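Morning - sodium ion inputs below, output right after.
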Amino acid sequence: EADCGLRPLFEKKSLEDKTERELLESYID
Amino acid sequence: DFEEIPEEYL
Amino acid sequence: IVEGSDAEIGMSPWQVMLFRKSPQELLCGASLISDRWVLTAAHCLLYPPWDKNFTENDLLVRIGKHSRTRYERNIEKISMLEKIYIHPRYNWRENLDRDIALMKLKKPVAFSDYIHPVCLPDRETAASLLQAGYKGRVTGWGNLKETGQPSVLQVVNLPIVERPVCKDSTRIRITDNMFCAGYKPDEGKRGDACEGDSGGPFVMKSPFNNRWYQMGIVSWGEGCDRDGKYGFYTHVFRLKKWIQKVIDQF
Ligand SMILES: N=C(N)NCCC[C@@H](NS(=O)(=O)Cc1ccccc1)C(=O)N1CCC[C@H]1C(=O)NCc1cc(Cl)ccc1CO
Ligand SMILES: *[C@@H]1O[C@H](CO)[C@@H](O)[C@H](O)[C@H]1NC(C)=O
Ligand code: NA
Ligand code: NA
């Protein structure tokens, strides 16, 4: 769906979960 | 260990 | 999930519980990919070495859950299965190659704060993100240790491992339809999936469009969280043509 992968309680409100930054930091390219 | 679920879901 | 933590509310709104009707128990994890389709591991439904061969009527799908055992009134939604589709070349005999299955629900599930589908990767997102060292996230209600059980959904972030290291960790023949993830003994941190987490999602958050993609399905390990072993995940993108064929046809 066009809205897939965007969480109502996180991305849709521009709130981050407590560990998603760990994922981003590993994406070194 | 699981709480009963409503009967409608059989 | 071993060495993980409690999920936040709404953290994994695509997480599905496969629930056996009789006896009432956790069968597996799974994920929501649209309002009518759920993705899981084939071995959750069919594994003859363990006398496992479930039919549609044996099972329920519970969506929107957080607590493992509670009936989460006004939050979770329970769906019946219309049809199961197992990959025709699923190799249960040898190594769980192509460990993937789809389930079509009888009726569409209503999305909510707690229920929302995950994206499936295209070739480009897969190429960019499926790299050694890059971390994904695994969720489930399976065992907290190999040899107990969680009150609520568990989450662990784990790095993708270089293919030679995956291969050298096991006597099983690894295929291109699998990848492995987990920390090495020297890395200190740990974590793994375990019994009951099967069929659940390995997800990554794209840094290009800030959406969550399901890259893997919890497939197999050798024990849980053992030093020098890794968890193996079905490579979702590699099997996407089959996924699309099933959804387009049915
Ligand atoms: N040299 C070999 N023969 N290697 C292949 C063994 C595969 C087997 N491993 S197991 O028997 O250890 C599963 C298990 C683990 C703990 C307790 C009971 C069973 C296994 O994982 N499974 C058998 C069919 C179901 C599957 C399974 O249990 N998957 C769950 C799982 C997934 C992941 Cl990613 C990590 C750890 C586990 C789970 O490992
Ligand atoms: C599993 O179940 C179906 C029907 O019960 C059957 O056709 C099949 O042969 C069984 N065993 C398999 C698929 O290995
Ligand atoms: Na090997
Ligand atoms: Na390990």
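Note: The pocket of sodium ion (ligand 4) is lined by residues C 182, 192, 225-227, 229-230 (CB under 6 Å).

O.
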